[PDB]
Write a protein that binds this ligand. Structure first.
Ligand SMILES: [Ca+2]
Ligand SMILES: [Ca+2]
Lengths: 585, 585
């Protein structure tokens, strides 16, 4: 075995508590090097001669190059020291501890998790653990009030092909009028892109953090929406841009006018004075040279307090959470204090960040609850849409991503297929609904929070921005009601099957040849096996099913009953068919 | 190469800034598996066409199983994305990025360090970067005030052999009287074990955090000590026990008296009332079943605030830092807020924790400045004292430890040889002064902060506690003045050679056969090579010395001038001799 490829650390994603007296521990090793992983542990102050407790670390998964083992240590003292005992293919017994590797336990030393503080157990909102989020781009969802429509508002038709500066009149009143549609779909939360006052079409350059943009509505209307949504079992999540403000931001306008004498000059990153000019910027902004988006100095206590007051104000309106853009460019102290503030005002308020790279630094439990799962989207696009990867690669990509963060974060990552900045997933599938449906079936049964992009549920298509921002199809005749019913059915199932929302994930089958992938979601005694035949061909597969997990299953989508024979389960799937097998527990 | 053994993460000790625009990056690989490591990077928003910057990652060291490469990325935008270009012995190359490994750069993906905030740049006190700390166990240092002696105090003699319940009358007045001695020695800070009021002899069970224990002195005397030490260029560091209090602590006595009616019941961890029992106790304590040491609930805002007021009180008396006991059992938020408070009152105040295992979670820059370097002591014990490890092993242990944390932490770790809880180093060396001196020579020239245990400088000896707690030897005729002058000279040298306090460290030579180890400290153009002949026999060795680093050196200990011939340096060292060669730069 390659000892240099074995990894563990007593913190982060490899050692973390799931409760005050339970510590989850993970170990990584070159694929195939470790056949058995056991943990020997005890209280940190325990006598040397004392018998050590034992915990077997089952193989939680495997990616392209590594195997992952996971164990749970029961630590009534809330203090624990531990060493790993690894057995290789040849029965070699290797101990692994903080000191290193050795054939002798005492020489391997022990990893230590000094203390488990209840305040350090990663905790996320309970409602968020079984949610189905719906992303609404206000300008294009529903025009409920034509009196606030901006000049140039185009016709709201299905054949409408939006331009970069098009206007259709979508607003908050429109969302309220369409709540019965959303309730029928079964969504439990609405995620809105920026709706705060801004002079641009995208509103990522905030002019007033304390006002709804006039073209969308006013405060009285927002309140109505919050209340009407809540009485429908639908929460509201607002997108906040705290990394930078717009050039119309009161503080920035003051600096543009007074400059050196501006009381807010230190709220931004200004190189020289005058603070700006036409086509030229001497201050730090979002990305590169974006004058309309001056970066906010969140490290400045005054800036931090101002934004915290902004958060306070909107939460007072009854919102249920925040989605943060460019979160990775705001400091960690700001995020740690933001969480403290938000959770104190409402422990059920969700905090989601947008970070396009490993976000472990923000997912330890003291900052965000979760982030956008862009890895999930990439894997699903390549497997279901473009066919760039096969079932085994798909399996490896999902597993690797799953092991990135502590389970509390992974369980609530927002699993999106597309967004306001990408082409529609149906379009990624080249219009193939069969492929589209299999990806949705997977989305609704996989680990994480499903996120639906407005219109996808009724068959809307489109290229990336701005063609992905086409007017929502409200004409039932123009809607793909068959797909709508498909979404509805999957959502109902996810809510009834505890394992789909709170279960763990384990790969069941992965065949690169047949391109068939299966996994099992498990919660307590309940097992739900999802079988995906991602191939334009009717195929048969023989899955392993030990009697311990059951001998009979029910396909929740067809009502077909299947039985196992001698630890094997024979299944026949039609082109791109997906099965959701419930073990009756 | 073995890709599974290659590691890097864009955080912690593998990716961290040293300035607002400079990111240090480190990568490990199986030793000898990678010959060249290059970093290709650019601003995270750079166009896919712009050329990438190049950074060559030199080999910063290697331990038992790994090679460590280190590079510095110049990031003027404070945002960076980067990929590694690795080359093996036989010229094969591969890109390593967040996505993974690939022969194609694009497929390897890219690691990203989202943003570098100035407030997140690990910063430690400038004075502590070149300090020499002296550990004083007050009860046994100097009895300057006989009038405050505890009942039953024993005579102060060299042949005295301390018992667990002994008393010699050491106090703060004594320390003041002996400041001339400490100034002569050249120490720049004094570290005191607990001195707060407590009924026990060890004082780890605090009765009053706001008062000096009557047997040691009082506030006026402590203020005098602080002022007299400062005018002699000596700082004062106090030991704080915030994890638990003593049973005499006012809050705990209130609980013992009022029980469930006590307003401080939640300041502790109790299971039921009343609180007590024989050999038994119904409340969480330090270690196991230690009645006099009830754990404090630092997570409780009242407890945290009370402890913060304690810190404010002593810093108001002028102290220069804190040494924290059982710091790993106090929560992280407490330490982050503690650092904020402490640094706001005195930016130069030092925070040192005592953690007997990987302390990376506390050494990111938002909590502690440093910790006790027990690894340094273990390595020095086994190499210089017991002879259990040879020169190559010694080298590996030092290197592995060095790569554990960011450089700002490593540069300030407290490198001790012994303490009030261990046998004296002289005794570990079986009374051999030659071995002892070579260890001190190493201590005084290695990376980290030298920590002297009281009396070691004058040749005191003894078994572990309480034999390591003998009364300080003051009678000059009974002190080892030769050793004293040796310490003094090494200390002067450390202050005159910038590379010994602010330089990096690189292994120069390691001969397991001759048991000879050499390393070089470097700062700017200055090079200081230390050669240790850790064997009881005169030996000759040929060290490699490229003309670039110089061809002439001076042994700062003897004044001997050495010359290199054709990139080689021939040296003949006497038994247990150590040389400190300065390149004259
Ligand atoms: Ca409208
Ligand atoms: Ca005394």
């Amino acid at each position: 075995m390659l000892l240099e490829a074995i990894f563990h650390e007593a913190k982060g994603s490899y050692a973390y508590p799931i409760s005050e007296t339970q510590l989850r521990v993970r170990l990584r090793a070159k694929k195939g090097d470790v056949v058995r992983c056991e943990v020997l542990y005890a209280d940190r102050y325990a006598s040397p001669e004392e018998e050590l407790a034992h915990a077997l670390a089952g193989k939680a998964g495997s990616d392209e190059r590594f195997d992952y083992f996971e164990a749970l240590l029961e630590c009534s003292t809330k203090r624990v020291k531990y060493v790993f005992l690894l057995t290789g293919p040849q029965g070699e017994a290797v101990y692994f501890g903080e000191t290193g590797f050795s054939a002798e336990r005492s020489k391997a030393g022990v990893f230590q998790y000094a203390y488990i503080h209840r305040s350090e157990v990663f905790t996320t909102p309970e409602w968020a653990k079984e949610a189905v989020i719906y992303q609404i781009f206000p300008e294009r969802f529903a025009n409920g009030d034509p009196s606030n429509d901006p000049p140039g508002t185009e016709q709201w038709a299905k054949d409408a092909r939006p331009r970069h500066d098009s206007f259709y009149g979508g607003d908050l009143k429109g969302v309220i009028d369409r709540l019965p549609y959303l309730e029928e779909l079964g969504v439990t939360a609405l995620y809105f892109t920026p709706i705060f006052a801004s002079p641009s079409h995208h509103k990522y350059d905030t002019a007033d953090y304390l006002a709804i943009d006039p073209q969308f509505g006013d405060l009285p209307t927002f309140r109505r929406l919050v209340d009407e949504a809540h009485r429908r079992g639908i929460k509201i999540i607002l997108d906040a841009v705290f990394n930078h403000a717009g050039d119309q931001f009161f503080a920035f306008r003051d600096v543009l006018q007074k400059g050196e004498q501006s009381r807010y000059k230190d709220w931004f990153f200004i190189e020289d004075f005058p603070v700006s000019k036409t086509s030229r910027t001497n201050y730090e902004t979002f990305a590169v040279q974006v004058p309309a988006m001056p970066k906010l100095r969140t490290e400045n206590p005054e800036v931090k307090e101002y934004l915290f007051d902004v958060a306070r104000f909107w939460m007072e309106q009854g919102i249920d959470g925040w989605r943060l853009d460019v979160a990775n460019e705001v400091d960690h102290a700001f995020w740690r204090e933001f969480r403290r503030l938000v959770k104190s005002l409402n422990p059920d308020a969700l905090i989601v960040g947008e970070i396009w790279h490993d976000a472990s630094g923000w997912l330890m439990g003291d900052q965000f609850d979760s982030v956008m799962n862009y890895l999930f989207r990439e894997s699903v696009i390549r497997f279901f849409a473009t066919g760039e990867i096969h079932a085994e690669r798909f399996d490896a990509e999902l597993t690797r991503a799953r092991m990135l963060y502590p389970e509390q974060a992974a369980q609530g990552l927002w699993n999106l297929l597309d967004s306001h900045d990408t082409e529609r997933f149906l379009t990624s599938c080249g219009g193939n609904e069969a492929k589209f449906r299999l990806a949705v079936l997977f989305q609704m049964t996989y680990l994480g929070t499903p996120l639906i992009y407005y219109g996808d549920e009724i068959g809307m298509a489109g290229a990336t921005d701005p063609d992905c921002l086409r007017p929502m199809i409200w004409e039932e005749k123009e809607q793909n009601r068959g797909l709508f019913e498909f979404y509805k059915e999957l959502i109902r199932l996810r809510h009834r099957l505890a394992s789909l929302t709170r279960g763990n994930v384990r790969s069941w089958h992965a065949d690169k040849q047949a391109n068939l992938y299966a996994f099992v979601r498990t919660v307590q005694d309940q097992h739900v096996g999802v079988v995906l035949n991602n191939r334009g061909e009717k195929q048969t597969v023989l899955l392993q099913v030990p009697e311990s997990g059951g001998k009979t299953w029910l396909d929740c989508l067809t009502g077909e009953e299947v039985h196992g024979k001698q630890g094997q389960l024979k299944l026949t799937l039609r082109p791109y068919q997906g099965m959701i097998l419930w073990n009756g527990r």
